[PDB]
UniProtKB/Swiss-Prot annotation:
It is found in: Nucleus; Nucleus, Nucleolus; Cytoplasm, Cytosol. Autophosphorylated at two clusters, the T2609 cluster and the S2056 cluster. Autophosphorylation induces a conformational change that leads to remodeling of the DNA-PK complex, requisite for efficient end processing and DNA repair. The chain holds residues 3591 to 3680 of 4128 of the full protein. DNA-PK is a heterotrimer of PRKDC and the Ku dimer (composed of XRCC6/Ku70 and XRCC5/Ku86). Formation of this complex may be promoted by interaction with ILF3. Component of the core long-range non-homologous end joining (NHEJ) complex (also named DNA-PK complex) composed of PRKDC, LIG4, XRCC4, XRCC6/Ku70, XRCC5/Ku86 and NHEJ1/XLF. Additional component of the NHEJ complex includes PAXX. Following autophosphorylation, PRKDC dissociates from DNA. Interacts with DNA-PKcs-interacting protein (KIP) with the region upstream the kinase domain. It comes from Homo sapiens. Serine/threonine-protein kinase that acts as a molecular sensor for DNA damage. Involved in DNA non-homologous end joining (NHEJ) required for double-strand break (DSB) repair and V(D)J recombination. Must be bound to DNA to express its catalytic properties. Promotes processing of hairpin DNA structures in V(D)J recombination by activation of the hairpin endonuclease artemis (DCLRE1C). Recruited by XRCC5 and XRCC6 to DNA ends and is required to (1) protect and align broken ends of DNA, thereby preventing their degradation, (2) and sequester the DSB for repair by NHEJ. Disulfide bonds: none annotated. It is linked to Immunodeficiency 26 with or without neurologic abnormalities: A form of severe combined immunodeficiency characterized by reduced or absent T and B cells, recurrent candidiasis, and lower respiratory tract infections. Some patients show dysmorphic features, severe growth failure, microcephaly, seizures, and impaired neurological functions. This is DNA-dependent protein kinase catalytic subunit.
Amino acid sequence: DVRAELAKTPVNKKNIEKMYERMYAALGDPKAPGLGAFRRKFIQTFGKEFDKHFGKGGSKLLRMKLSDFNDITNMLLLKMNKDSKPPGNL
């Protein structure tokens, strides 16, 4: 959806970061209210790299071009989706 947003118009900063806020509030911060120990794994293994390939607060993503972002997130997913055993029990 940001891969559409970043190409929907000339790049639209406040809104592009609002989506990073959605993402990082969901899946970037380890200090979540009701975080599960399974999902914590993904956060530790990639929240770091969201700070690096994107910026903390989205700064790189706020200016980065879509041909880069597309393959940045493809690369992230190519290593996330590599394997990940879904949790068994609440």
